[PDB]
Write a protein that binds this DNA or RNA. Structure first.
Lengths: 623, 624, 624
RNA sequence: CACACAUAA
């Protein structure tokens, strides 16, 4: 039992009472909200040849724990909010696992109680840190996580539900010891860069206090870590031999600026196939995976050495240059709004669809509360079809990455969406080609599509991903020097150290998501990445403004229309039919939605003026 | 970009702008409707020893399709119309793939825009042809697809949505080069055979124009096909040796008319086990699959040679003889209607269930209720349980095949269903035993069940499947001679060249679905298949009419009943309850549903008079 | 066809007409309800090292005329009733399979018709027995199953739906030849032990009549069982050599009373690693699974020998001792009710949530997946998270064991739930740690949480599980000696012979579920298990009463509140919104539930007083 | 094993 004071908020951490059979278990309570988190790791190595870590955050109720929904999990599955929360917890603990820890691991979160005041998602991140800290699972230092909000110009740590509604910033910071930053995830209301940067410093300060509390509990409990059967890092003998065999060939490939995505990847594969045959005869007793991983380490090292020593990327540009950006709007006559945004070899097609305000509810109390209701009747749906990477995969359903990128792009465009719009706004982003930050291209393409559709957004929104390449001391672990890369390619993200996706208007920041592969980075690097990304965002907005600078004066002539019809009381029964049979038959035959306003007035929403025309023919003949 | 003119309609083909990473990609636009189709094929042979081809046609948003609430709902969120369209595209392009192309392939269709006038399903089939033609995937010859309708006596190519609603025919034709036919799929309003056959001729001519346009685009673009690392076909020398080993034994099995489905397959399995061991020792270095495929080649060739040379089939029938047909009706008292149709070793149990109109096509969620309503309040649900073939399988959710067979059987019975029926008609067909065309037996059995249930259908509907066995010289690819088989068995479909399922009444055709396994067949063969099936259809209808010839004079006395109950305004609040809680509870414990049709009256629908008794005692005590 | 008379009930059994392709099929008809059950077993040995047996019972509401309810107009998912019935059929037929029969097997039940009078779930169990008896699948003697009710103090065999609603007992008995019992599954309205016991012997008497009828049908129609490729059982000489290696080490582990669950499992596993390595050297050609199973045979035999010979268990308890029981209530402030029940190393956390009355009608009509309404507004959700056993597994649904345990614990507490409670009672039971009967700990912890929350339950409910260890004749198979164990651990259930989960009040029995692994046990053993569990139940209730003995005088202050708000007619449109949009929006972001009672009256339900405060502000500004 | 998780995203 350890209590951590974070300003006026109190955090209580305990262990050893519930779920004693798990490898690690902890209960983190703030106020009257208690969350129990368990960690289980198998002692038998898994054949997956990577780290199989899965985080499952579950809630027993929706709408601030007021509508019980846990009994519906067998068919109503997992909500979208739970998946996003699991992604945040996953990103806070994944980088800290030791390299080569190829053992199945699962972290589960149970909401013992929710008071509707303190948000349990932050307590879940801390609970996952305490459970792994107190367990015998090999894990690096404890992680503290807080949420920073801004209310009336004041920075509030772990704001309540009431305070978060009046906040202009929703930033979650995960911190490692020595004030390192592990995970960042924010959605701001177009706040200034200086205000945003100060809140990160405040957040990292609080996470240090939590780490101090968790360390004390670890010392009192007396935790001893297991000895894994084998850490699957390749031996230094194999790596140093692979360097002598493929350094100069990989160096030539990565300094060739005529390569595009597929040709560069093919060229690397050609070296991999030739080298791996020579590696097998050199070490016949070596594990087949160790041959695979030894080449990956060498290729990654050669890729980073060029950036560090020559300040030039694999495609020839410098650390601050953007890829070629092309924009286009109004491609199809029938779409309410459309845009095609291309960034290098990343292609994203965005579509804006207007619908009735009544489409934001599912007509069922439980299901509507599960997915919630959007504040501005605005949502974004992000798709990553398998042909974007010339691959074959299942097309039904959205994986975790698609959910995360959709919420990131939606948060970026949210602050500029106007209120009291007559229609529900749906933005659909499809990644036709992918070589980089397609999620940020969904904010740029979504902004162009919204302006093309006639939605009077306050300002355009652009995004950009910032990569990182560091050279750290092998023993001390300190970062000797680093390079910040603007608008990274896929290979630069794969071989890089972070994926700093940040979007906003030309005078503020609206969304941010940092995906750090390192076990924490200094706050100075994060500070410089935000400033560097703002320069890139200025250039991108210049290109977009040439294509379209202001929303069109009105919606498309063939767009949705809302009209009001009058039915007499005598004719009411015939028009509606037996139990609303006629209204739903008309809805299912022409797509028009009819709602009852008052005892004589019916609201009619039609997707097209033609659909209204034929629907009105039904109304006239039935009356 | 290439524009193909099909009468008064225009087809626009494009490539090289969107999704350049895919192996092939194309955008087909008609009017203001555009569909982009991509094809991806791996360079590594798949572990499975067949061609894995997946076609996924996805509607981006009907009205505003939005997104399913969660992952599991997404995995079930594919609509029935999307699945049927994907099957049509799959059958149009699968026969043109080379033999032995055991590589994973996926074709994905994305609806860029829909104007509500030009139907995108036909454009998707063409887009899949252009995408595969411009890709490096080896695909034999482009195909073209058009939809032919009959509006007030005129054959219309690619009719609009308004024209399709007044059409008496909904026929989709996919054609290969040289006027071949790859796919056929029709849904007619009981039209004459001569009118139906002419529409096929008109459609094939139009698809040749599309193929000409695609061929020009291929030549102008400069497509180069990949070289697969291995085409998995048995070597000619190992097939020849297998022929000498098992020609006589297989010939004896296929000439033995005392075999049924299980016995014949068991006998062939016995020869396969004996032959495979001998093959392995002769060719130790042969691929283990190559041993299996060599026997399948030999068994298929022996099976087809018997019918080509002797005009006799494995069960002793000639080319136009039907299997034994027996029918029953009214087997269970509580069923609204029932029928047990048996054809050969295929048994189908059909049930008819009536339900209220309000709870007949209408669900609670209007957003998802679209693509879920029926024109005549009529639908058919088809089930293929795993015990029909003595196999073990999952029973969770219908697969694509069950959805396709149910739609085909529903289209066959749709034109005879009366309009303005008091109740929603639902026909359930279960395949208890499967050895042949179970989908067609669902039309015949469904017709009997509808007649037994008391539904005044205009005429009885019967269906049949027609097979094909051809002899083609590999040096030319032409078809020298062929045999058309009536009411094929399972082995005749497996070793045959087509599955020509056509259904209709005694004076017209109501549905058709040709599943051609050859890379195109001439129009003459299709012309004779329809005529030959006409003879078989009338023979089946003779047997069916013996069991029952007209619908029963009235519905069963223990069927659903509807009447109104008057509720005063003062009693309305107590009767309905807070938020309709009392009615919702009543509809749960008992099957009765209460729908308000007037400010003072309520329409009560009870599935059975016995359940109606339970409802009446509830509403009497509520009234007090 | 064979007819069996059960008092006033008639049971018609037939075969040879439908689904003739399956290995075994049968149709069982009582009254107008007929059920067809088919059994299919593969011939190739399964890759899995156990018995793969799946039983699927499908409602198929087309038989009742009430299948078409949702927008897909077909059933989606499997209901709770379907899953529970499948488990009962599985428990009745699983023990009779021969040991080592590792062949894939599936049993499928199809409801041809239901009259709404005779329950088809009992006929499904009999049909599963006839289908297997007539098949060639190796299966032991036929099983007869009946349902016994008590109406007006009279025992009724196979009661109808009308009688089942006025019955104080719902007991299902499956019997083997020689009056053995293979399955017991009951739920009673707190009936006396003697009345409960007399129904069991009445039920077994009726099952013998059914078995006699099935035997006659099997005699009439020739049944020849297949010869499996091999029965996967360890060699007698390999088992004997394993016994010599690990007799003493295993005996030492099981006589060490200081072991807990994990340490005991690890100590046994250490001997397994040492012995299995030595076994391979002695028998190089033996199957790798044969080595694994031979050790499990020796370990099981040593474990049971200690109990039989010395009357002491692996943790030092005698045959009638309970583990340490610790209770605790009022765990958290915001929960309406909560309790933490611990028994030995099994820890269960129970929660009570009061919901609106309108949220308990989740059924087919409104929801595409849910079906039915609980009689009393009361349900129990049971969860078994993977960390309860230090394991990693999927956490989504599709778990039948959780459904079975939840239903057992729910009907254990159902008789004591008060009638006409203003709110829906939902009890959530989570197994934080498991080393035994977590399903019965859910009943003990459920009553503590219900009393803590303020629900005026009639009396407390406790549960316990009784194991069994028998020494049977190697040839005859008759039971020569047996020991009944109270509150078995996980190892005692795994190595035992039955899992007799029986719960109830201090003066009666409310639930029972016997999981017998033997091919039938004498009724005398069942009788003594009930008596033994009665003694344990009183001891458990004594401990529970010390923590809390009576329900709290009132619900918690932060519990739900229901109050009515009057709106004028002129403001009805503004408050409700277009098509009820405002009500659906307020209730989605606040958690309240508004139901229109009268023209001007709206009943607002708020889960917490704070929620009502937020809602009241929302209504107040709307009224402005 | 598969599934889910992570993965040139």
């Amino acid at each position: 039992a350890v209590a951590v004071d974070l300003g006026n908020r109190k955090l209580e951490i305990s262990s050893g009472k519930l779920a004693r059979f798990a490898d690690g278990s902890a209960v983190v309570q703030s106020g009257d909200t208690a969350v129990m988190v368990t960690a289980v790791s198998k002692t038998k190595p898994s054949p997956s040849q990577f780290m199989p870590l899965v985080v499952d955050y579950r809630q027993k109720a929706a709408a601030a724990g007021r509508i019980p929904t846990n009994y519906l999990r067998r068919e109503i599955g997992t909500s979208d909010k739970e998946i996003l929360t699991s992604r945040i917890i996953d990103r806070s603990i994944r980088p800290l696992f030791p390299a080569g820890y190829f053992y199945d691991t699962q972290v589960l979160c149970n909401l013992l109680a929710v008071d509707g005041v303190n948000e349990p998602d932050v307590l879940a991140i801390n609970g996952a840190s305490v459970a792994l800290s107190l367990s015998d699972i090999p894990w690096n230092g404890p992680v503290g996580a807080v949420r920073i909000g801004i209310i009336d110009g004041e920075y509030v740590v772990n704001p309540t539900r009431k305070e978060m509604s009046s906040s202009t910033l929703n930033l979650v910071v995960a911190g490692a010891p020595k004030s390192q930053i592990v995970m960042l995830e924010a959605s701001a209301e177009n706040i200034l860069q200086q205000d945003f940067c100060h809140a990160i410093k405040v957040g990292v300060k609080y996470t240090q206090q939590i780490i101090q509390g968790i360390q004390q509990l670890v010392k009192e409990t007396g935790v001893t870590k297991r000895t894994p059967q084998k850490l699957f890092t390749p031996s230094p003998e194999i790596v140093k031999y692979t360097h002598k065999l493929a350094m100069e060939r990989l160096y030539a490939v990565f300094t060739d600026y005529e390569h595009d995505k597929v040709s560069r990847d093919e060229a690397v594969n050609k070296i991999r196939l030739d080298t791996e045959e020579q590696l097998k005869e050199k070490f016949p007793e070596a594990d087949p995976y160790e041959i695979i991983e030894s080449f990956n380490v060498v290729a990654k090292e050669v890729f980073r050495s060029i950036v560090l020593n020559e300040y030039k990327r694999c495609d020839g540009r410098d650390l601050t240059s953007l890829r070629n950006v092309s924009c286009e709007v109004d491609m199809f006559k029938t779409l309410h709004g459309s845009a095609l945004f291309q960034r290098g070899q990343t292609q994203v097609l965005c579509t804006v669809t207007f619908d009735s305000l009544e489409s934001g509810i599912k007509s069922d109390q439980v299901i509507t509360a599960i997915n919630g209701i959007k504040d501005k009747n605005f949502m974004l749906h992000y798709e990553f079809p398998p042909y974007a990477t010339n691959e074959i995969g299942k097309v039904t359903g959205l994986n975790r990455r698609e959910l995360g990128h959709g919420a990131l792009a939606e948060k970026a465009l949210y602050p500029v969406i106007p209120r009291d719009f007559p229609f529900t706004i749906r933005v659909t982003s499809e990644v036709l080609e992918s070589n980089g930050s397609s999620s940020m291209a969904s904010a740029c393409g979504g902004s162009l599509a919204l302006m093309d559709s006639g939605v009077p957004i306050s300002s355009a929104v652009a995004g950009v991903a910032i990569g990182l390449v560091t050279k750290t001391d092998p023993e001390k672990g300190e970062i000797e020097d680093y390079r910040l890369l603007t608008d990274i390619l896929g290979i630069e993200d794969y071989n890089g150290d972070m994926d700093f996706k940040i979007a906003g208007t030309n005078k503020g920041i609206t969304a941010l998501q940092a995906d750090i592969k390192l076990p924490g980075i200094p706050i100075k690097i994060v500070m410089e990445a935000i400033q560097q990304a703002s320069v890139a965002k200025k250039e991108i907005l210049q290109i977009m403004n040439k294509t379209i600078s202001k929303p069109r004066a009105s919606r498309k002539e063939n767009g949705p229309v809302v009209e009001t019809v009058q039915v007499p009381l005598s004719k009411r029964a015939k028009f509606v039919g037996p139990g609303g049979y006629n209204l739903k038959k008309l809805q299912a035959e022409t797509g028009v939605t009819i709602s009852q306003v008052d005892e004589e007035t019916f609201s009619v929403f039609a997707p097209t003026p033609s659909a209204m025309h034929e629907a009105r023919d039904f109304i006239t003949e039935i009356c």
